[PDB]
Amino acid sequence: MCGTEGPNFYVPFSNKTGVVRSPFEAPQYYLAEPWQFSMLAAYMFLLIMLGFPINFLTLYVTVQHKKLRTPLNYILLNLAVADLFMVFGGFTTTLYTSLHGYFVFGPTGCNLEGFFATLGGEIALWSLVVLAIERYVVVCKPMSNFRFGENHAIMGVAFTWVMALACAAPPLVGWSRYIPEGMQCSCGIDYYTPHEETNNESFVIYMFVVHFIIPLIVIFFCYGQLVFTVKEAAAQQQESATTQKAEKEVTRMVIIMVIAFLICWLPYAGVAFYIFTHQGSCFGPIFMTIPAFFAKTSAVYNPVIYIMMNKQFRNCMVTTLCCGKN
Numbered sequence: 001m002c003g004t005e006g007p008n009f010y011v012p013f014s015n016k017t018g019v020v021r022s023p024f025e026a027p028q029y030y031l032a033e034p035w036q037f038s039m040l041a042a043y044m045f046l047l048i049m050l051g052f053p054i055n056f057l058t059l060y061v062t063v064q065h066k067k068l069r070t071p072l073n074y075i076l077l078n079l080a081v082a083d084l085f086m087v088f089g090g091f092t093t094t095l096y097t098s099l100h101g102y103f104v105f106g107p108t109g110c111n112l113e114g115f116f117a118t119l120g121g122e123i124a125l126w127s128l129v130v131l132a133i134e135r136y137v138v139v140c141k142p143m144s145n146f147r148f149g150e151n152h153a154i155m156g157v158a159f160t161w162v163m164a165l166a167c168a169a170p171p172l173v174g175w176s177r178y179i180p181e182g183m184q185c186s187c188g189i190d191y192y193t194p195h196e197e198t199n200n201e202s203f204v205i206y207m208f209v210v211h212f213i214i215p216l217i218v219i220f221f222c223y224g225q226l227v228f229t230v231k232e233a234a235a236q237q238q239e240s241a242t243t244q245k246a247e248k249e250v251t252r253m254v255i256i257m258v259i260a261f262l263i264c265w266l267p268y269a270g271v272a273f274y275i276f277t278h279q280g281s282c283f284g285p286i287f288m289t290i291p292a293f294f295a296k297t298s299a300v301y302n303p304v305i306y307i308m309m310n311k312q313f314r315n316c317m318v319t320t321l322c323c324g325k326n
């Protein structure tokens with residue numbers, strides 16, 4: 001008797017006192033004090049105020065600078081759009097619901113907010129996977145007669161949308177489901193109940209294998225091989241101080257990107273490990289949503305790492321912000 005069940009929700013709070021209410025109807029101030037809902041709102045406001053400008057500016061400077069519109073940069077624009085889906089499908093709705101203390105848009109809005117927020121995060125995840133694959137192909141040259149062009153980059157972008165849809169769409173039609181989660185102000189995949197009517201168990205396995213294990217392996221393999229190839233070529237040209245300088249910065253950047261990916265990935269692994277190692281206590285709204293809570297900031301630091309640290313985008317952003325000068 002850990003929470004309270006109802007049609008389309010699971011409030012992680014016991015109803016022996018009789019105070020639990022539908023998260024679609026009344027504020028959940030027994031899960032958390034009102035000031036903590038306000039802090040959830042303040043957190044959403046921070047993500048909005050940092051997330052929108054950085055990601056919109058990425059799309060904007062690409063319009064003004066011809067040299068950014070190269071096929072290898074298409075996946076980065078896809079990343080920027082995905083973060084905007086998270087900013088407007090998730091953060092802004094959650095800022096609005098948190099100030100009410102519950103999900104005021106009903107079960108239909110729960111599927112909408114759940115779908116688009118899950119879609120945004122999925123497109124971003126697979127954009128990082130596709131970018132790793134593309135860089136591996138260009139550098140390690142595993143295909144002998146291959147040249148990466150416009151059609152290939154479009155293929156990679158469409159691939160992320162397909163992978164994002166095959167995660168975000170099944171809960172709309174009977175495999176798992178979308179319900180309020182955590183403090184019940186935002187909606188997502190039901191990892192919290194074993195709803196047999198929608199076969200939640202098998203969807204969690206499928207999420208774990210395809211959308212969690214595989215992205216980590218691909219990112220690690222591609223960047224591992226890329227670093228190996230680059231170190232290998234630089235070893236054959238140690239008389240070039242710039243070759244060694246480029247090798248050091250490629251390695252340093254791959255380390256930064258892998259560590260950033262692990263900072264978002266490991267919390268899920270730790271919490272899932274705890275849920276399956278102990279598996280004997282009730283998990284409050286906060287605990288099993290802690291990985292999701294901190295993974296939201298990826299809408300801010302991913303464009304910082306993949307775009308603002310790119311030498312091209314940075315100078316074009318400075319030129320755009322400073323009205324064409326400097």
Ligand SMILES: *[C@@H]1O[C@H](CO)[C@@H](O[C@@H]2O[C@H](CO)[C@@H](O[C@@H]3O[C@H](CO[C@H]4O[C@H](CO)[C@@H](O)[C@H](O)[C@@H]4O)[C@@H](O)[C@H](O[C@H]4O[C@H](CO)[C@@H](O)[C@H](O)[C@@H]4O)[C@@H]3O)[C@H](O)[C@H]2NC(C)=O)[C@H](O)[C@H]1NC(C)=O
Pocket residue numbers: 004005006015017018019020021022
């Ligand atoms: C967590 O647990 C709490 C406590 O159990 C639940 O809250 C209760 O929910 C029930 C509804 O399931 C509330 O029901 C009350 O009784 C009447 C319902 O209509 C009945 O009317 C008669 C009497 O039985 C019959 O025709 C028929 O059986 C109907 O089922 C209403 O009359 C009540 O309305 C209010 O006004 C009347 C006067 O009209 C007052 O006298 C009543 O006291 C009442 O306040 C009401 O609908 C019950 O009141 C709820 N209790 C509390 C404390 O809120 C939650 O549902 C549960 N949470 C979740 C998420 O499931």
Ligand SMILES: CC(C)[C@H](C(=O)N1CCC2(CC1)Oc1ccccc1O2)c1ccc(Cl)cc1
Pocket residue numbers: 118121122125167204205207208211212264265268269272295
């Ligand atoms: C993009 C999200 C839609 C998706 C996501 O939210 N989940 C999938 C992974 C998850 C938690 C739910 O599923 C799991 C199933 C079982 C065990 C652990 C699990 O972790 C995601 C989030 C962060 C990363 Cl890095 C990768 C994927």
Ligand SMILES: CCCCCCCCO[C@@H]1O[C@H](CO)[C@@H](O)[C@H](O)[C@H]1O
Pocket residue numbers: 027095096099100101
């Ligand atoms: C951009 C920010 C918009 C915030 C809108 C917040 C509207 C809050 O609305 C309030 O919600 C309470 C439930 O907690 C109700 O009791 C109040 O009657 C209602 O006015």
Ligand SMILES: CCCCCCCCO[C@@H]1O[C@H](CO)[C@@H](O)[C@H](O)[C@H]1O
Pocket residue numbers: 090117118120121122124125128186187188189261264291292295296298
């Ligand atoms: C390196 C990974 C970058 C993308 C991270 C995306 C994080 C998405 O996080 C997910 O968001 C959903 C909607 O809010 C929630 O329902 C899920 O519980 C949460 O894990």
Ligand SMILES: CCCCCCCCO[C@@H]1O[C@H](CO)[C@@H](O)[C@H](O)[C@H]1O
Pocket residue numbers: 219220221223224225227251254255258
């Ligand atoms: C998933 C891809 C991660 C690649 C991380 C590669 C980090 C390698 O980093 C390099 O390691 C060498 C020893 O192996 C050291 O001699 C170098 O100084 C160091 O730059």
Ligand SMILES: CCCCCCCCO[C@@H]1O[C@H](CO)[C@@H](O)[C@H](O)[C@H]1O
Pocket residue numbers: 040094180181182183184185186187285286287289290292293
């Ligand atoms: C670091 C301080 C605790 C952070 C974890 C707080 C967990 C509250 O749970 C939160 O509920 C919100 C409303 O549904 C969701 O939008 C968040 O994804 C979820 O983490």
Ligand SMILES: *C(=O)CCCCCCCCCCCCCCC
Pocket residue numbers: 318321322323
């Ligand atoms: C190039 O940058 C020349 C233009 C001068 C811009 C300087 C002003 C930028 C200030 C950005 C920080 C805004 C802070 C708002 C905090 C709420």
